[PDB]
């Protein structure tokens, strides 16, 4: 789902 891309960016940045 393209509408989930910015959540993955936010998750990946917050992760580490």
């Amino acid at each position: 789902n393209w509408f989930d891309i910015t959540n993955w960016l936010w998750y990946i940045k917050k992760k580490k």
Epitope: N1, W2, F3, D4, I5, T6, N7, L9, W10, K13, K14
Partner: antibody, heavy 124, light 109 residues
Framework: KVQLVQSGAELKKPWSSVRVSCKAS????????FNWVRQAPGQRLEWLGG????????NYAQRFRGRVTISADRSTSTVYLEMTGLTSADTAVYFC?????????????????WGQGTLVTVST | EIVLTQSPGTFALSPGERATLSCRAS???????LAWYQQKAGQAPRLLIY???GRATGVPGRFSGSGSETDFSLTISRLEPEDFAVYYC?????????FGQGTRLETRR
């Protein structure tokens, strides 16, 4: 406060092209999804597509595949809609919209911030 | 493509009454990715509800959203005069986002 400011009304002949700009201010730009939605006079909302600027990722409504291109200029915090092959069926108000931001900065996907709208009239 | 069908088309109510608007999807909407917007004549849409039940910032507490799968609701617990408007639902649970056709709330007489 997040604000989206669009370019002015457009008058175009059929089979020409239109470019509409949307300048964002008041927050971060590149890591949020920007979308374009249109509304023909007296009719329903219709999603056209979107872009995530940071990763240059676009997504278009299948009924406009090929006719619609969305782009972004990070240095000016501006997102653009290009639509080719115009006909009177494309006469509408065009809105840019950006997704909301929730607690902990989480992007909300739904469209919380909206431009003022841009009338595009396609006619001979 | 997920088709969203709103009902009723037009609702006639009065301030003080509860309004329940419905939005039915032709197939399950993934992860409750469903939002509700308000639109008044000549204005941009306004986000009310995101993710089925999340209340957008600055939206009054009398608005709430509910549902799952293929059936979603927007409830206005007690209408005020400024609530008479058009309401749209939208699904964004798959890459091809779609909107319902809208429900208009009119004042009864």
């Amino acid at each position: 406060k997040v604000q989206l400011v669009q370019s002015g009304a457009e008058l175009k002949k059929p089979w020409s092209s239109v470019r509409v700009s949307c300048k964002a201010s008041g927050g971060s730009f590149s890591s949020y999804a920007f979308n374009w939605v249109r509304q023909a006079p007296g009719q329903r909302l219709e999603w056209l597509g979107g872009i995530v600027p940071l990763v240059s990722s676009t997504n278009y409504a299948q009924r406009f595949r090929g006719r619609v291109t969305i782009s972004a200029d990070r240095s000016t915090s501006t997102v653009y809609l290009e639509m080719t092959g115009l006909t009177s069926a494309d006469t509408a108000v065009y809105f840019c919209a950006r997704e909301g931001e929730g607690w902990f900065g989480r992007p909300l996907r739904a469209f919380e911030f909206w431009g003022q709208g841009t009338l595009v009239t396609v006619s001979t | 493509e997920i088709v969203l069908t709103q009902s009723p088309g037009t609702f006639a109510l009065s301030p003080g009454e509860r309004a329940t608007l419905s939005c039915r999807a032709s197939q399950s909407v993934s992860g409750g990715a469903l939002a509700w917007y308000q639109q008044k004549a000549g204005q941009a849409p306004r986000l009310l509800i995101y993710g089925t039940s999340g209340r957008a910032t600055g939206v009054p507490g009398r608005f709430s959203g509910s549902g799952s799968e293929t059936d979603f609701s927007l409830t206005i617990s007690r209408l005020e005069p400024e609530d008479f408007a058009v309401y749209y639902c939208q699904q964004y649970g798959t890459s091809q986002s779609t909107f319902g056709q809208g429900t208009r709330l009119e004042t009864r007489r």
